[PDB]
Structures are given as structure tokens and as C-alpha cells.
Amino acid sequence: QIDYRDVFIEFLTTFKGNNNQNKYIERINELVAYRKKSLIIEFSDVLSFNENLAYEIINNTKIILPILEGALYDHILQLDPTYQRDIEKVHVRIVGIPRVIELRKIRSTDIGKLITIDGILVKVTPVKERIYKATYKHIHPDCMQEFEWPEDEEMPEVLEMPTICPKCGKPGQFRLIPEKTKLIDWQKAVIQERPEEVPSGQLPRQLEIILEDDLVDSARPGDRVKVTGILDIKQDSPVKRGSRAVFDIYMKVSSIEVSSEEDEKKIKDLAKDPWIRDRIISSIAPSIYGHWELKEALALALFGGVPKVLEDTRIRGDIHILIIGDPGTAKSQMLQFISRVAPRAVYTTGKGSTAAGLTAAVVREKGTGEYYLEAGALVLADGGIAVIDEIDKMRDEDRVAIHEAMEQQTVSIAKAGIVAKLNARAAVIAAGNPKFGRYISERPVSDNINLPPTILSRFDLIFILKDQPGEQDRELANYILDVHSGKSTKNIIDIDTLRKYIAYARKYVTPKITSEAKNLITDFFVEMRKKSSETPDSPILITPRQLEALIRISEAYAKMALKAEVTREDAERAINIMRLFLESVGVDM
């Protein structure tokens, strides 16, 4: 009854934020400057300003939304006439709806209402075009007339062809005219419920969502997203008569969120502590006793180095870690922790993986007999971390796919007439067991781990964990029992804060190596080569590839402390950890 365009338009112009900045007028600025055509409004902000406007949006969404969109378009038109003839429609998207429903708990009462669902994006289709206003021509020698068939409305989800010519009243043949046909961008994605919500003994459920217009290509597979929109029943084969009055539900997306100022302030305060590096290392797997050297290396892999593109070749910034340890050395516990704290990570197992599942799988579209690719584990981990457990138990045919990923950071696909090269810039963390149960110190690493030497040289660091009973057993027993009793360590950065800290560092920090750091690295290398030249009788090689690892590790240390330069201390720490690896593999100085 009461028009809400008046209260809405002044709400945009008059609204004060946390720091008294008038965000919405600032947000609407680049909407006309950069031609976004889409606006984002928080539900809490609208509710505080006027609850009547807020509750009208949730309930009467299908009616108030077109009215509100028209009001904002007029506001932009008077503010900048240049918007006309450029963008003819503006979308306003609402986020933060309190009505959040689990994927498994959707029932018939929620159809046609604005709801929000949290899940994981698993499938994305290529962008396509959908007709919303067609133009036909009547093929009848008398007629030769053109008209817009879905008059006075929009073309439904089912393409319907006119049966009677509206301009002559006769049936016959109608020809589509693509030149005058109106189109709109259209994409389809599949969302899956998070593993924490799956009940015992059940399999995860999936929901189909539709992204249209500017919402296309707003997310990548494997991302955790929050999606808001309207549920509706799905019609795909109306002509398939005969039983089956049962339909599936699909979601019509109106706004999507992936995964900000106070958090940035909190991150900066943490970096101010001189001992921030020690705090971060102590926060890695707090429930595991000892393994300080391994924890330090795992922290470096989370941040990584800086990739370099030379005149001819490319230098990866990712760090590869290989762990060999006796059974029960808590190898799998840390890898689970790493996969949970990293902003983007994929956890796999040697036995539960295949070559197609790791890189890309060809799927034949039985509906049209068409071939298309599906992203594998390594592709989904691009820009993140790939964790592989029990690498020694993987099949040889499935292991060769990893060889290219670690070396060239690429995956080559040539099958079913599809040829492509895929980026796989991901850090690889692998764990394995020795051949004969426990580890034999006297024998070299190569004959004690059951892996080809061609894959050993591709790892930046290798660590050996030995479970030898000794005087530390009492400390280990006391620590474990305290964990089972609920006792927790203090001064530990929590998972959520740690994940945000890593994401910020990987995005805004690019350390540069100073002259002093270069001299220390060079001097260590050349003196090591001279020492190694006397007697290079070790299973572990000392090739110039080790020099690149020293560069990567030093950059990671600087990035951990949010520093823009690599100083003497960072280079010194990188040498120490590299020196241990060059000697803990069974070879002395």
C-alpha cells in the first residue's frame, strides 16, 4: 500500500556507518563511474534504518524488488545522464537475510520465499544465453509478418512457440529471428552441503542453482559460498508424458557471497609483535607434542615464496615438503590440521585417488553426446595447497601425473579430442612410511622409503620422524593425557584468525631480497659446493636446485612477519633450516 521508494531513496543518501563515512553514497559512486549495474545492501543496515522496509523485502520480494530497482535507476539517471544508452537496468542485491536453512531441511513450505543456504560449490557450467523475449516471423506467403511472441510477459523457462499468428489469425510455420531476439546471460552451478552437516551414515546432498546476468563467473569450484534467492520447482522434459508428477527444486540466485576492516586492523596488530614468527609456529597443531622443526617447515609452506617470471623460464614460489615417519608419529594429524587452516587446500589419499581424479576427468554429456572436462584435485588446488597422504601406497600410473605438477606447475590433457594445458600452481605436502616398518638410520633415504629417486629431487625439504622410545616418553604421556582432559595451551592464535592472517599475507606482501641477504646465500652455497666437491658421497644431491629452495624459504620467512624486504636475519634462518635438511638425511658436514 505505502510506497517504500521514498524511504528507500533517502536511506541510500542518508545512512551513517561505523566511522561516519556514508558508505552507500560512496558505494553508489563507482557504480556509475565503473558501470557495475549491481548494488549490494546489508539487511542489518536496512533493518536498523526502518524495519518496515526490511520486512517488506523479505516477504514481498517478488513485487517490491522491481519497484526498488526502478527508483535507483532514476537516481542514477539524474546523478549522471551518461548512464543512459549504456546500462538500461540496475540490480539491487540483498545479503544477510536471517532466514538461513540447512540444505537437508528444505521442505515444501519454503518454496517461493527468500532464503539463504551455505554450502560448497562443486560444479560450474560455461556461460550461456537465455531468451527472455523472442521475435518470430510467420512463414505463410500471405503473412511475412514479425512479432514478439511472449507479449505482455516474459518467456517462461520452457520455450513455447506460437500456434496462431497474432497478425493474421492463421496457424503454420514460424521462424525465429535472432537479430531482434532479446538475450540474457545464464549459468548453472551445483552446491553441496558442508561435511559437518551430513548426518551419520548418510551421503551429502546437492542443490542446483542458477546464476544470471552479472552474477555469472562469480565463484570457482571448491569454494565455500553463501547464496540467497528464491526456490522453485524444476521443469526439464514437459513433453515426457506418463507418470512422474514429482519435481526437483532449484534455487534462483539473487546474491552470492564467498567465504573486513576490523580484521585487517587485527592482523596488523599481530605483526607488530617481534616474536610473531614464534607465535605462529606454536599455533600449528597445538595438540601435537614436539616436532618443532617439522612445524616450522609446515608454516613456511602455508605462506610460500614469490614466483618469478624470467626471460625464458619460470620459477615457482611454492614449497614442497615430504615427510617420512614411523607409524603413529602423528603424521596424519598435522596434515588434517594443515588442510583445515589453509585458506584453500585439498586433502587426498594415495589409495583413494586416480589419475583422472587428480588432474581432470572427461564427462560425456549423454543428453547431447558431448565431451567436456571436469576439474581434478590438483586443478582445484591451484593457488593453494595439495595434501597427499600415503603417497608411497599410490599406484605408479597415478603418480606420474604429480611429476609434471611439482616440476612445471602445469597439467597436460589430451584425450577424447580435447587438448589443453592447465595451471596447477599448488604446494604439495606428502607423507609416507618407511619400507620395513620403523626407519633404519644407517641405510640411505633412497632405499628406505620405497620411492623413485626422480621424485625425491622435486621436494624442497624432506623430514624423517623416528619414534624411538626414550626419556621423553613421560613428557609425551603427560601432554597427551592433558589433551584428553580438556586442558589447552595458552597464547595460541585460533584457526579463524590464523587463516585470515595467511590469506592477507599471501595477497599483499611480496618481499624483495636485499644485497646483504644475497651475499649470505651465495657465500653459503659456494662454500658448501667446495666442501661437497671434496666428497659428494651422499644419496641427497646438492644441485643448484637447492639454491632456489633457499631463495623461496627466505622469502616465506619475510612474508610470515609481513615484511617487505628480506633482511640478514631471514636469510640466516633459511640457511639454518636448509642446513639441517642437508645433514639430517644421513650425511654429515
The annotation places the binding site for ATP at 325-332
* Contacts (CB under 7 A) with DNA, residues 512-551: none
Q: Which does 206 bind (CB under 5 to 8 A by kind): Zn ion, DNA, a copy of itself, none?
A: none
CB of 496 to a copy of itself, least distance (A): 33
Distance, CA of 136 to CA of 110 (rounded, Å): 37
Options 163-171, 323-331, 543-551, 559-567: segment touching Mg ion (CB under 5 A): 323-331
Choice from 61, 206, 354, 584 touching DNA (CB under 7 A): 354
Binding partner selected for residue 332 from Mg ion, Zn ion, DNA, none, CB under the kind-specific 5 to 8 Å limit: Mg ion
CB-count burial class (<10 Å; 0-12, 13-18, 19+) for 581: buried
Q: Which is nearer to a copy of itself, 112 or 352 (CB)?
A: 112
DSSP string computed for 290-345: S-HHHHHHHHHHHH----EE-SS-EE-----EEEEE-TTSSHHHHHHHHHHHSSSE
Span interacting with DNA, options 116-124, 318-326, 350-358, 468-476, rule CB under 7 A: 350-358
168 binds, among Zn ion, DNA, Mg ion, none (CB under 5 to 8 A by kind): Zn ion
Q: Which of 540, 39, 493 is nearest to 270 (CA)?
A: 493
Among 106, 155, 356, 492, binds DNA (CB under 7 A): 356
Cβ-based burial of 82 (10 A; exposed 0-12, middle 13-18, buried ≥19): exposed
Q: Work out the angle between the directed axes of helices 331-341 and 292-303 (0-180°, nearest 10).
A: 30
Stretch that binds Mg ion, among 55-63, 328-336, 435-443, 519-527 (CB under 5 A): 328-336
Considering only 66-74, 302-310, 352-360, 545-553, which stretch makes contact with DNA by CB under 7 A? 352-360
| Cell 612474508 sits on residue | 559
Site string for DNA, 368-407 (x = CB under 7 A): ----------------------------------------
Which one, of 452, 427, 439, lies nearest residue 324 by Cα? Answer: 439
Residue nearest to Mg ion (CB): 332
Residues in contact with 565: Cβ distance below 8 Å, sequence separation at least 6, in sequence order: 511, 512, 513, 514, 558
Stretch that binds Zn ion, among 37-45, 162-170, 308-316, 430-438 (CB under 5 A): 162-170
DSSP alpha helices (H): ranges in 60-182?
61-79
Residue 415 as a binder of DNA (CB under 7 A): the answer is yes
Among Zn ion, Mg ion, DNA, none, residue 92 binds (CB under 5-8 Å by kind): none
Determine if 349 is a binding residue for Mg ion (CB under 5 A). Answer: no
Residues forming the site for a copy of itself (CB under 8 A)? 104, 106-108, 111-112, 122-123, 127, 129, 139-141, 156, 158, 160, 163-164, 166, 172-173, 175, 178-179, 183-185, 192, 195, 217, 417-423
> Which of 57-65, 319-327, 359-367, 493-501 is the region at the interface with DNA (rule: CB under 7 A)?
359-367
Which residue, 174 or 459, has its beta carbon nearer to Zn ion?
174
CA dihedral 256, 262, 266, 271 (to 10 degrees): 80
- Judged by beta carbon distances under 5 to 8 A according to partner kind, the member of Zn ion, Mg ion, DNA, none in contact with residue 143 is Zn ion
Q: Which does 356 bind (CB under 5 to 8 A by kind): DNA, Mg ion, a copy of itself, none?
A: DNA
Lookup: cell for 426: 599448488
Using CA atoms, how far apart are residues 98 and 586, in angstroms rounded to an integer? 60
CB 563 within 8 A of CB 514: no
Task: Please identify, using beta-carbon distances, which residue of 194 and 415 lies nearer to DNA.
Answer: 415
Going by C-alpha positions, the residue among 473, 464, 468 that lies closest to residue 444 is: 464
Q: Are 462 and 546 in contact (CB under 8 A)?
A: no
Chain residues 119-138 in contact with Zn ion, contact rule CB under 5 A: 138
Could you tell which of Mg ion, a copy of itself, DNA, none binds residue 481, using a CB distance below 5 to 8 A set by kind?
none
**495 and 340 Cβ atoms separated by less than 8 Å:** yes
The residues with which 251 forms a beta bridge, in sequence order, are 209, 231
Among 103, 256, 345, 360, binds DNA (CB under 7 A): 360
CB of 105 to a copy of itself, least distance (A): 9
Q: Closer CB to Zn ion, residue 168 or residue 281?
A: 168
Tell which one of 9, 122, 168, 362 touches Zn ion (CB under 5 A).
168
Distance CA 220, CA 380 (A): 9
For 113, residues 6+ apart whose C-beta sits below 8 A from its C-beta are: 61, 99, 230, 231
* 174: contact with Zn ion by CB under 5 A: no
Nearer to Mg ion by Cβ, of 295 and 331: the residue is 331
Q: How many residues bind Mg ion (CB under 5 A)?
A: 2
Residue 524 CA to residue 577 CA, distance in Å, equals 13
**Element of type H or E holding 152:** none
Compute the radius of gyration of the chain from its Cα atoms: 30
By beta carbon distance, the residue nearest Zn ion is: 165
Cα distance between residue 287 and residue 333, in whole Å: 9
Would you list which residues are annotated within the binding site? 325-332
Q: Does 364 bind DNA (CB under 7 A)?
A: yes
Cβ proximity to a copy of itself, 258 vs 420, nearer residue: 420
Q: Are 498 and 364 in contact (CB under 8 A)?
A: no
Q: Which is nearer to Mg ion, 282 or 332 (CB)?
A: 332
Q: Which residues contact 124 (CB under 8 A, 6 or more apart)?
A: 187, 188, 189, 219, 220, 221
What is the number of residues in the chain? 589
- The site for Zn ion (CB under 5 A) is made up of 138, 143, 165, 168
- The site for DNA (CB under 7 A) is made up of 354-357, 360-362, 364, 415-416
